Amino acid sequence: VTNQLQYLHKVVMKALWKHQFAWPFRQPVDAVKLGLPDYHKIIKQPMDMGTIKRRLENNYYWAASECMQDFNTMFTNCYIYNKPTDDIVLMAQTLEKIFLQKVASMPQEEQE
Amino acid sequence: GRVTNQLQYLHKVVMKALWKHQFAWPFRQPVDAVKLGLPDYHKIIKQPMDMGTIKRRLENNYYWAASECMQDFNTMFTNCYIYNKPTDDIVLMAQTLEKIFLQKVASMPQEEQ
Numbered sequence: 001v002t003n004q005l006q007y008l009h010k011v012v013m014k015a016l017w018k019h020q021f022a023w024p025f026r027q028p029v030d031a032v033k034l035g036l037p038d039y040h041k042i043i044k045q046p047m048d049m050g051t052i053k054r055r056l057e058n059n060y061y062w063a064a065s066e067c068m069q070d071f072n073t074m075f076t077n078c079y080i081y082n083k084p085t086d087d088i089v090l091m092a093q094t095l096e097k098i099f100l101q102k103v104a105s106m107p108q109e110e111q112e
Numbered sequence: 113g114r115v116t117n118q119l120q121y122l123h124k125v126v127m128k129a130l131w132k133h134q135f136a137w138p139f140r141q142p143v144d145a146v147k148l149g150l151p152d153y154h155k156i157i158k159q160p161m162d163m164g165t166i167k168r169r170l171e172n173n174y175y176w177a178a179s180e181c182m183q184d185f186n187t188m189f190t191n192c193y194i195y196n197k198p199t200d201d202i203v204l205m206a207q208t209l210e211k212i213f214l215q216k217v218a219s220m221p222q223e224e225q
Protein backbone atom coordinates (compact mmCIF):
# COMPACT_ATOMS: atom_id res chain seq x y z
CA VAL A 1 0.00 0.00 0.00
CA THR A 2 1.04 3.65 -0.74
CA ASN A 3 -0.91 6.98 -0.97
CA GLN A 4 -0.26 6.94 -4.79
CA LEU A 5 -1.54 3.32 -5.26
CA GLN A 6 -4.66 4.05 -3.09
CA TYR A 7 -5.13 7.12 -5.38
CA LEU A 8 -4.92 4.91 -8.56
CA HIS A 9 -7.42 2.49 -6.83
CA LYS A 10 -9.92 4.93 -5.18
CA VAL A 11 -9.81 7.79 -7.81
CA VAL A 12 -8.38 6.42 -11.15
CA MET A 13 -9.80 2.82 -11.24
CA LYS A 14 -13.11 3.97 -9.55
CA ALA A 15 -13.74 6.54 -12.37
CA LEU A 16 -12.63 4.30 -15.33
CA TRP A 17 -14.19 0.93 -14.21
CA LYS A 18 -17.80 2.39 -14.12
CA HIS A 19 -17.30 4.46 -17.36
CA GLN A 20 -19.89 3.75 -20.14
CA PHE A 21 -16.92 3.05 -22.54
CA ALA A 22 -15.06 0.79 -20.03
CA TRP A 23 -16.84 -2.54 -20.86
CA PRO A 24 -14.39 -3.70 -23.63
CA PHE A 25 -11.42 -3.21 -21.18
CA ARG A 26 -12.92 -4.90 -18.02
CA GLN A 27 -11.59 -8.41 -18.97
CA PRO A 28 -8.80 -9.82 -21.20
CA VAL A 29 -9.33 -9.70 -25.01
CA ASP A 30 -10.84 -13.12 -25.99
CA ALA A 31 -9.45 -13.73 -29.57
CA VAL A 32 -11.76 -16.83 -29.92
CA LYS A 33 -14.92 -14.94 -28.67
CA LEU A 34 -14.04 -11.73 -30.64
CA GLY A 35 -12.76 -13.67 -33.73
CA LEU A 36 -9.22 -12.14 -33.75
CA PRO A 37 -6.86 -15.05 -34.61
CA ASP A 38 -3.88 -12.62 -35.13
CA TYR A 39 -4.41 -10.76 -31.78
CA HIS A 40 -1.82 -12.72 -29.66
CA LYS A 41 0.69 -12.60 -32.62
CA ILE A 42 0.56 -8.72 -32.70
CA ILE A 43 0.03 -8.06 -28.93
CA LYS A 44 2.65 -9.86 -26.71
CA GLN A 45 1.72 -8.35 -23.27
CA PRO A 46 -2.12 -8.39 -22.97
CA MET A 47 -3.54 -6.03 -20.24
CA ASP A 48 -7.10 -5.13 -19.04
CA MET A 49 -8.80 -3.20 -16.16
CA GLY A 50 -9.99 -6.49 -14.52
CA THR A 51 -6.32 -7.62 -14.02
CA ILE A 52 -5.21 -4.10 -12.81
CA LYS A 53 -8.24 -3.91 -10.37
CA ARG A 54 -7.40 -7.40 -8.90
CA ARG A 55 -3.69 -6.29 -8.59
CA LEU A 56 -4.73 -3.05 -6.74
CA GLU A 57 -7.09 -5.13 -4.46
CA ASN A 58 -4.24 -7.66 -3.62
CA ASN A 59 -1.40 -5.03 -3.24
CA TYR A 60 0.42 -6.76 -6.20
CA TYR A 61 2.22 -3.46 -7.13
CA TRP A 62 5.38 -2.05 -5.38
CA ALA A 63 5.34 1.40 -7.15
CA ALA A 64 2.59 3.65 -8.67
CA SER A 65 4.65 3.83 -11.93
CA GLU A 66 4.20 -0.01 -12.15
CA CYS A 67 0.33 0.33 -12.08
CA MET A 68 0.48 3.37 -14.48
CA GLN A 69 2.57 1.25 -16.97
CA ASP A 70 -0.23 -1.44 -16.99
CA PHE A 71 -2.91 1.23 -17.85
CA ASN A 72 -0.51 2.53 -20.58
CA THR A 73 0.05 -1.06 -21.89
CA MET A 74 -3.77 -1.64 -21.99
CA PHE A 75 -4.32 1.59 -24.05
CA THR A 76 -1.20 1.12 -26.28
CA ASN A 77 -2.23 -2.51 -27.15
CA CYS A 78 -5.61 -1.07 -28.32
CA TYR A 79 -4.12 1.67 -30.61
CA ILE A 80 -1.51 -0.78 -32.10
CA TYR A 81 -3.80 -3.77 -32.97
CA ASN A 82 -7.06 -1.92 -33.96
CA LYS A 83 -7.69 0.06 -37.23
CA PRO A 84 -7.45 3.89 -36.77
CA THR A 85 -11.19 4.20 -37.75
CA ASP A 86 -12.45 1.63 -35.14
CA ASP A 87 -14.82 2.91 -32.36
CA ILE A 88 -12.67 0.97 -29.76
CA VAL A 89 -9.80 3.49 -30.41
CA LEU A 90 -12.16 6.47 -29.65
CA MET A 91 -13.32 4.63 -26.47
CA ALA A 92 -9.62 4.00 -25.54
CA GLN A 93 -8.77 7.73 -26.20
CA THR A 94 -11.69 8.89 -23.90
CA LEU A 95 -10.62 6.53 -21.02
CA GLU A 96 -6.90 7.54 -21.37
CA LYS A 97 -7.89 11.27 -21.20
CA ILE A 98 -9.53 10.64 -17.75
CA PHE A 99 -6.51 8.46 -16.65
CA LEU A 100 -4.11 11.35 -17.50
CA GLN A 101 -6.45 14.07 -16.05
CA LYS A 102 -6.47 12.09 -12.72
CA VAL A 103 -2.69 11.20 -12.78
CA ALA A 104 -1.92 15.00 -13.01
CA SER A 105 -3.49 15.32 -9.47
CA MET A 106 -1.85 12.12 -8.01
CA PRO A 107 0.18 12.54 -4.74
CA GLN A 108 3.79 13.57 -5.66
CA GLU A 109 5.80 11.41 -3.15
CA GLU A 110 5.17 7.61 -2.87
CA GLN A 111 5.05 7.50 1.00
CA GLU A 112 4.41 3.90 2.28
CA GLY B 113 -2.25 31.06 -20.40
CA ARG B 114 -0.30 31.09 -17.07
CA VAL B 115 2.82 29.52 -15.37
CA THR B 116 2.50 26.90 -12.53
CA ASN B 117 4.99 24.55 -10.73
CA GLN B 118 3.66 21.48 -12.69
CA LEU B 119 4.16 23.16 -16.15
CA GLN B 120 7.74 24.11 -14.95
CA TYR B 121 8.35 20.42 -14.00
CA LEU B 122 6.90 19.26 -17.41
CA HIS B 123 9.23 21.80 -19.18
CA LYS B 124 12.43 21.47 -17.04
CA VAL B 125 12.24 17.76 -15.89
CA VAL B 126 9.99 15.67 -18.26
CA MET B 127 10.56 17.45 -21.63
CA LYS B 128 14.38 17.72 -20.95
CA ALA B 129 14.72 13.91 -20.33
CA LEU B 130 12.63 12.92 -23.41
CA TRP B 131 14.26 15.54 -25.75
CA LYS B 132 17.90 14.32 -25.20
CA HIS B 133 16.82 10.62 -25.51
CA GLN B 134 18.50 8.59 -28.33
CA PHE B 135 14.98 7.58 -29.63
CA ALA B 136 13.56 11.20 -29.36
CA TRP B 137 14.75 12.51 -32.81
CA PRO B 138 11.62 11.42 -34.81
CA PHE B 139 9.42 13.33 -32.24
CA ARG B 140 11.34 16.69 -31.95
CA GLN B 141 9.61 18.33 -35.01
CA PRO B 142 6.23 17.88 -36.77
CA VAL B 143 5.93 14.85 -39.17
CA ASP B 144 6.78 16.15 -42.71
CA ALA B 145 4.48 13.86 -44.80
CA VAL B 146 5.91 15.29 -48.11
CA LYS B 147 9.64 14.89 -47.12
CA LEU B 148 9.12 11.41 -45.45
CA GLY B 149 6.89 10.14 -48.35
CA LEU B 150 3.72 9.48 -46.23
CA PRO B 151 0.82 10.68 -48.46
CA ASP B 152 -1.97 9.17 -46.21
CA TYR B 153 -0.51 10.64 -42.94
CA HIS B 154 -2.87 13.69 -42.60
CA LYS B 155 -5.87 11.54 -43.80
CA ILE B 156 -5.31 9.24 -40.71
CA ILE B 157 -3.76 11.63 -38.09
CA LYS B 158 -6.11 14.68 -37.81
CA GLN B 159 -4.37 16.26 -34.73
CA PRO B 160 -0.58 16.21 -35.37
CA MET B 161 1.61 16.86 -32.28
CA ASP B 162 5.39 16.79 -31.56
CA MET B 163 7.65 17.73 -28.58
CA GLY B 164 8.81 20.79 -30.63
CA THR B 165 5.17 22.10 -30.60
CA ILE B 166 4.80 21.14 -26.86
CA LYS B 167 8.16 22.89 -26.01
CA ARG B 168 7.29 26.18 -27.85
CA ARG B 169 3.81 25.99 -26.14
CA LEU B 170 5.41 25.71 -22.62
CA GLU B 171 7.83 28.59 -23.59
CA ASN B 172 5.03 30.95 -24.90
CA ASN B 173 2.67 30.21 -21.90
CA TYR B 174 0.00 28.49 -24.12
CA TYR B 175 -1.07 25.94 -21.40
CA TRP B 176 -3.48 26.77 -18.49
CA ALA B 177 -2.96 23.46 -16.55
CA ALA B 178 -0.37 20.58 -16.60
CA SER B 179 -3.20 18.19 -17.78
CA GLU B 180 -3.51 20.16 -21.12
CA CYS B 181 0.27 19.65 -21.77
CA MET B 182 0.07 15.92 -20.76
CA GLN B 183 -2.87 15.41 -23.25
CA ASP B 184 -0.60 16.88 -26.01
CA PHE B 185 2.13 14.31 -25.02
CA ASN B 186 -0.50 11.50 -25.13
CA THR B 187 -1.77 12.61 -28.62
CA MET B 188 1.88 12.63 -29.88
CA PHE B 189 2.40 8.97 -28.75
CA THR B 190 -1.15 7.83 -29.73
CA ASN B 191 -0.70 9.28 -33.31
CA CYS B 192 2.51 7.12 -33.62
CA TYR B 193 0.75 3.86 -32.49
CA ILE B 194 -2.35 4.57 -34.70
CA TYR B 195 -0.51 5.49 -37.98
CA ASN B 196 2.54 3.14 -38.00
CA LYS B 197 2.63 -0.69 -38.49
CA PRO B 198 2.96 -2.57 -35.13
CA THR B 199 6.39 -4.09 -36.08
CA ASP B 200 7.87 -0.64 -37.03
CA ASP B 201 10.87 0.51 -34.88
CA ILE B 202 9.14 3.98 -34.44
CA VAL B 203 6.42 2.21 -32.31
CA LEU B 204 9.19 0.73 -30.06
CA MET B 205 10.83 4.23 -29.81
CA ALA B 206 7.45 5.83 -28.79
CA GLN B 207 6.68 3.10 -26.12
CA THR B 208 10.20 3.66 -24.58
CA LEU B 209 9.75 7.50 -24.52
CA GLU B 210 6.13 7.10 -23.23
CA LYS B 211 7.34 4.85 -20.31
CA ILE B 212 9.88 7.59 -19.25
CA PHE B 213 7.08 10.26 -19.57
CA LEU B 214 4.74 8.30 -17.21
CA GLN B 215 7.61 7.62 -14.67
CA LYS B 216 8.43 11.41 -14.58
CA VAL B 217 4.71 12.52 -14.51
CA ALA B 218 4.34 10.27 -11.37
CA SER B 219 6.95 12.49 -9.52
CA MET B 220 5.22 15.80 -10.56
CA PRO B 221 4.26 18.19 -7.68
CA GLN B 222 0.76 17.13 -6.40
CA GLU B 223 -1.19 20.48 -6.29
CA GLU B 224 -1.08 23.09 -9.15
CA GLN B 225 0.42 26.57 -8.28
Ligand SMILES: Cn1cc(-c2nc[nH]c2-c2ccc(F)cc2)ccc1=O
Pocket residue numbers: 023024025029034077078081082088
Ligand atom coordinates in the same frame (compact mmCIF):
# COMPACT_ATOMS: atom_id res chain seq x y z
C1 LIG C 1 -9.21 -4.04 -25.95
N1 LIG C 1 -10.04 -4.56 -27.04
C2 LIG C 1 -11.28 -4.99 -26.77
C3 LIG C 1 -12.08 -5.55 -27.76
C4 LIG C 1 -13.47 -5.96 -27.45
N2 LIG C 1 -13.74 -6.36 -26.15
C5 LIG C 1 -15.05 -6.60 -26.14
N3 LIG C 1 -15.63 -6.37 -27.34
C6 LIG C 1 -14.65 -5.95 -28.20
C7 LIG C 1 -14.96 -5.61 -29.60
C8 LIG C 1 -15.82 -6.41 -30.35
C9 LIG C 1 -16.16 -6.09 -31.66
C10 LIG C 1 -15.64 -4.92 -32.20
F1 LIG C 1 -15.95 -4.59 -33.47
C11 LIG C 1 -14.81 -4.08 -31.48
C12 LIG C 1 -14.48 -4.42 -30.16
C13 LIG C 1 -11.60 -5.56 -29.10
C14 LIG C 1 -10.33 -5.14 -29.37
C15 LIG C 1 -9.47 -4.62 -28.32
O1 LIG C 1 -8.30 -4.22 -28.51
Ligand SMILES: Cn1cc(-c2nc[nH]c2-c2ccc(F)cc2)ccc1=O
Pocket residue numbers: 137138139143148191192195196202
Ligand atom coordinates in the same frame (compact mmCIF):
# COMPACT_ATOMS: atom_id res chain seq x y z
C1 LIG D 1 6.10 10.45 -35.39
N1 LIG D 1 6.69 9.88 -36.61
C2 LIG D 1 7.88 10.33 -37.02
C3 LIG D 1 8.45 9.85 -38.19
C4 LIG D 1 9.80 10.29 -38.63
N2 LIG D 1 10.24 11.55 -38.23
C5 LIG D 1 11.49 11.62 -38.70
N3 LIG D 1 11.86 10.51 -39.36
C6 LIG D 1 10.80 9.64 -39.33
C7 LIG D 1 10.89 8.30 -39.96
C8 LIG D 1 11.39 8.17 -41.25
C9 LIG D 1 11.49 6.92 -41.85
C10 LIG D 1 11.09 5.80 -41.13
F1 LIG D 1 11.18 4.59 -41.69
C11 LIG D 1 10.60 5.89 -39.83
C12 LIG D 1 10.52 7.16 -39.25
C13 LIG D 1 7.78 8.81 -38.88
C14 LIG D 1 6.57 8.37 -38.46
C15 LIG D 1 5.95 8.90 -37.29
O1 LIG D 1 4.86 8.53 -36.87
